[PDB]
Structures are given as structure tokens and as C-alpha cells.
Amino acid sequence: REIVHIQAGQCGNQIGAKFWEVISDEHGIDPTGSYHGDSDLQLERINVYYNEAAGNKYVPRAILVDLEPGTMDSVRSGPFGQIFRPDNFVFGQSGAGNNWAKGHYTEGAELVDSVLDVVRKESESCDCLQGFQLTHSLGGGTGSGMGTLLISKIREEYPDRIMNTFSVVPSPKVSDTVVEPYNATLSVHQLVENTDETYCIDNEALYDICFRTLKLTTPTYGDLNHLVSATMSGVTTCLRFPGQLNADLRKLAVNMVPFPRLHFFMPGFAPLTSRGSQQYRALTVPELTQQMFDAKNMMAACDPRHGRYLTVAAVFRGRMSMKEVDEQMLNVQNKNSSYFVEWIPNNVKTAVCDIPPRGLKMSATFIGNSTAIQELFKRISEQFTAMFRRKAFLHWYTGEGMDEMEFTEAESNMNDLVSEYQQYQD
């Protein structure tokens, strides 16, 4: 029944800053820590993410990890940085510098032991864990590097808990680190087989949505990470709150994974349009389904109609008829039958929660597992190869002891995921 969340890397720490904000919004918990809500449900299932400390203080069940105090400090300095206890800030001193080898292989490795100890302390604080969630970037040093290391140890300690992670996937246009594909390649090599599932977030796609449908001209990462948190929070609240359908994360995982190795997801979100049009929108189930199916409302820079859909999850929040939902999903399946895989009859699955997100009447979360995902892997693998041959920045990595044959195997493994998507693309 409970979940532990660990954030890492500057990305992960800033995403989590919005995530937790939202969760407390959902439950009426004040930036200082106490509960000042107003709904029974708000406290009722609070356990999944909060420990109530003496005084009616709620402690977010999460660990903030970094290798630079300053980022942690900036998190702590805002509202909701006060709700986190000092003991959840685990950090070192001297960066990682966006270096996998430092993060995973060497220096960051040193910190992980202290992180894990706190993890253990929290695992004991829970009655019964459902699982763990981690937030991070695929091409980052602590985000992926150190984060991955941690994941391999947590999974080891808890094989029976859900291990998932959401991660920022290097967008085709904006890479920061020259070896960002290298770090990503290494994380695939480690993560894929050490996780139950991973979500693919593309900032470029997010920037398109924010202007494309939301028509906004000023977003920052906090605004885009709001959208990220909308999908993350969407998933777990249902599990938390009363609904109609089947509201268990593990069951979601079961329904979305047809094969042990292909567990990559494309998140999307509805409704998600500018205020101008809000006066011209109608709120129906087909309306949400139109926004959910549309590739432009995906947060991943993929194109599901290019690939084939293996699995689709449609999560609904708010009062909807069962009939309408059933029929519209069927219609989707029918009309987009050319994209769905024939091996899975009725490949579109649903989940229904009766609690709407604060401020909306209804909402829906799109989760997909298509073959289209392989295109991201292909882009990375290719870029990787070029760098691999030149050893760009690999003296930094090999200087910290990372061996090229390990990287070679990582490359293969990327290619293996692509070939397996091809094996089920048919």
C-alpha cells in the first residue's frame, strides 16, 4: 500500500519539487506541513505518500538526492521544501558533473550507501509497500548514473515491489552533455533489466504542447514539470482514491507489459488546451479521447501511429459513464485498428477513478506502449556509435575506470530492444 519516491539529479530534484507540491494540493496539505484540508478523502489515503509525524505534520515519503548542496538548498528554500525533513536530503559535495562514471561507477557510488540506509529506514516506516518510484534524467550523471546504482540495490532488496521510474529522455534537439547519449546508453544497459517500467519524457515535445495547444509563450521548466506531475499524480491517485475500475498500480503494470523486456511508456494528457478555447470546448468522454489519442498531446517525442500499439491505458478522473467510456474506447480501437497489434484482442484497457483533479471536471491520462519508442533508441544508438568510435569524453569516463567493452555491450542491448520491438512490430 505505500510508495517511496526518490528524486535525483538537478532535473529529478526540480521535477519532484512540482510533484510533491501537487500531491499536497490534492490532499490540502500546507507548505509548512500541516493538514488543512477539507475532505475526508484527503486524509484517508494519505499514507501512501505521507507519514504523519507528531503534531499533524506530514512527511513526504521521499528522498532528495544530489551531489551539490546548492540545488538541494534551492529546493528547500521554497514552499514544500519545509515539509521535507532534513533527513531526506542526502547529498555530497562535489558534483558528478554529469558523469556516469562518477555517479555510478565511482564517486556517487560512495554516497549511495547513505541514501540506501535512509531508504531502509523508510521501508520500515511503511506498513506495506506497493512500490517505489524514481525521478530522473537519462543522460545525467546523478540522475541516471547514481540513480541507476540505487535502483539496482533497491530492487535487490525488494524484488516484490514495483520499480518504476520516469525519466527525461534526451530530446533530439537539446542535449546538454556531449555524451548525453552515452549516459543514456549506459542507463539502458542498466535500467531496462533492473526496472519494471520506465516512462519517456521529451522536453521538446513538451515545449511544443505548451505552445501548440496551451498557446503559452513563457514556460519554464516548472511549468513543463507541472505537466509531468499531472501524469504522475494522475496515476497514483486513483490508486489512492475511490473509483470504479481497477485501481492498482501493479495491475496497471501487468496490463501494460506483454513481454519482460519491453516496458517503455509514452505518457499523454487530457484535457490540455488554452483558456480561449475553453469557452468553446465541450466536456465529454469523446472529447477526452480525442485529446488522448492525438499524438500531439503526447509528452514523448514519438509517433504512435508510426509504430504499432502494443498496449494502451486510459485512466479517467471524475464522473463518467461506464457505457460512454467503453464505447469510446471501442471506437478508438476500431478506427485506429491499423495501429494496434493483432495479437492482443481489445488492446485498449481502462481505469476509472471518481475523483477529478482539482479545478477540473474531468481528466484523462494516456499511457502507451508502442513500437514507435524504438525510434528514440535508434537515434541514441547511432549517435552513440559515432562517439564511441571517437571516445569523446571517454577519457573522462575511462579515466574513472569505465571500460569500453561494457559500453559495447550497452550498445548491443540498445539494439536488442529495437530488435525486440521489431519482433513484435511485425
Binding site: 498496449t311 461506464m322 457505457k323 495479437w343 492482443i344
Partner: protein, 428 residues
Amino acid sequence: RECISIHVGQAGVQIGNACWELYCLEHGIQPDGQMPSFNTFFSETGAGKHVPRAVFVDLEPTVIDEVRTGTYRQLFHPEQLITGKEDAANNYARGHYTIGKEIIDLVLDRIRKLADQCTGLQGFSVFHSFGGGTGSGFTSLLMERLSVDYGKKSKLEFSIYPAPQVSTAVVEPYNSILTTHTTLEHSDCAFMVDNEAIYDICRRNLDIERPTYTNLNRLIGQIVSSITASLRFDGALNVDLTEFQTNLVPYPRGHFPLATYAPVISAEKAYHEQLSVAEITNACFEPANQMVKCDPRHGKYMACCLLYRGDVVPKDVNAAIATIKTKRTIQFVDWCPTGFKVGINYEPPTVVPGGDLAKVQRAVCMLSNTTAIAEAWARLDHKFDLMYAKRAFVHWYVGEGMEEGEFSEAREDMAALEKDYEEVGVDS
């Protein structure tokens, strides 16, 4: 003369919520149990509170909590409200095995406690859904134990039939195939309805284009009450549950009678229109009121049971039967003569205050076993096959200890079942 209701899973429990609400409506039972006035279902306390003899099982706290926070929380005994912490995840492998198998012993002991409270246990019935984790997983687990302890008691199951077009559970075929395998062999009779078909009923007979499950379950509740409340109440032909089994199950396989219900009429549709017994039964043989999307004209009938509420005179019924036997296109299997069970209760049909259905003065419920059901299995066959051929989602079961051979086997058992329908279709 007692019976036990068992509500497993959301579908089982939320339907149950409607069911027990209706039983309260049948007698004027207050949320606290106070009844001023049906002890076949209820157990009496010295305060005049009655406890519905039923068990509620959910492996996720939420739905039971919904009960616990609603009005009927006072009605139900805290021990009847059983909850786990984690779910089956749409998955038999956890529902029947890994997870549900841990709590089931408790569940059984509460059942046994109620069985000891019963003085003359006639039997019981289980409400669930063919696709879910607890809905079908746990459910069959229960049957495995109940059929031992209560081998001679009625084992009637009611389950939601997976809609061919909309399903939220990608591995529902797999779940349902596994249940076939295990329920066919243990249960006595399983009934099912299709929410999609029901939507069509709601939009055509009730004129409602916005059905929710809370509407859908009211309609189900109507059908259930006809066979549960009114069969214990007085009539001309008082039919028991064991009698139902004895009059509806023709073979030792299962059988799966499908529900049809007429009257389902909006208040405005009731105006300007006079139904007779015969007219209502005419509606009962129309595809249009068929609660499962399966064409009555496709198959052949094997069994049929008609249960009457309110203002029904056997005289009229007899005439109605004569015409359905001879006027209709109802093909029937040789084996069967037309001995259709007629239950005739004087007990009037009841309507939920604030519901959609019109107050009616008489009502007819129809159960029927048609050969067209094999097509439903055919649907499952291919859906299963597709997934299984690709082995999509297979790791979610294998990791819990399921065997691939087992899955093949279960499909084959379904195929055998289809073949037996084929057999019945061959007239002899």
C-alpha cells in the same frame, strides 16, 4: 431456508450495494438495520436489527471503505466487510493464487460463521466479473473451497460478461479463460450480462444516453430481486433457489443461462401503454431486450425460465406460453421439451426511488440457455489466441508462477466447451 450472498471485487460489491439497497427497499429496512417489519436473507438481533447474510470481499480497501462510509455502513456488520491491502492487478495469478490466497482463509471462516448462523442453508450466490483479478481470480479460489464445504448447497454465480467492444483489461481473455477452466468444474450455474447490451437497453427503453454503473447496477438489481426477494415471498408458484437450479441446469457442464428482462421502461414510455403478461413476455423474446450481446435467433434454446411478479394470472401466462411456443421463431433443441419454469409470485415488482424505471404492476424475468453462447467463447478464443501467440503480457502471470501449458490447457477446455455446444446443437 437461508442463503448467503457473496460480493467479490468492485463489480461484485457495487452490484451488491444496489442489491442490498433494494432489499432494504423491499421491506423498509433502515440503514441502521432497523426493520419494522424476510429472514431468509437476514439475521435478527434483539434490537430488531437485521443483518444481511452476506460477505464483502475486496483486496483493495477503497470500495469496502465506500461501503463503510455510506449509509449502509450501519447495516453491515464490520466482520462482513473484509478487506486486504493489495490488488490482484487484473490478474488471476495473484487473485487466485499469490495474493488472494492469503486472505481467503479469513473470508471462509466468516462464511462458515454465517453458515453456522444458518439453520437451513439452502445455498448461496456469488457476484463478480469475468475479467477481473479478484472478480474472477479470487472468485474461483473461493469456489474451490466452497464446493468442498458446501457441496450440496446451491452454487450460483453471477458475473459480468466481458463486453466484446469495451474492455479495460487487456488480459481479460486470459483471465476469463482461466476462470472457465476452474469455474466450469466447480460451479453449478453461472449467469452473465453485458454492460454494452445494457447501455442499449438504457438508451432505447429508458431513453438514457448517460448510463453509469450506478444505473446499470440498478437494472441488474431488479433482475436479481426477482429471483431472490420474490422467490422467497408468497406466490402461486413459489419457486426456490434449489428449484431454480433443478429447473435450469440441464447438463453437468455448465451451463450459462443468460438474462433477459422486460419491463424496462421509462416513466414516459409507460404512459399511454398497457402491458399485459403476454405483452411483456413478447418483449422477453425480443433480441432488443437481451441483456447480453448475443443474438437469440442465432442459437437454439435449451432452457428457459420465466419468473413473474405482481399482477399475473396463470391463465394469461398459459396463453402467453402457447404463443411463444408456437408463434415465435424460437428454435429449440430436441432434447427439450418446452418445459419452461413458470414462477408466479404475487409479490409486486419494486422500483428504486429516484430510479429510471417506471412503476410497473407486473414483471417478467427470463433466463435462457442458448447455443449462441459458443460464439461468445469464440470471441474469447481469438482474443486469447492473439495475445498468447505473441505472448503479450505473459510475464505478468509467469512471474507469479503460472504455466504456459496451463494456459493452453484452459483454452482447450474452452474449446471442449464449445464443442459440447456444437453437440447440443446437433439435434438429434
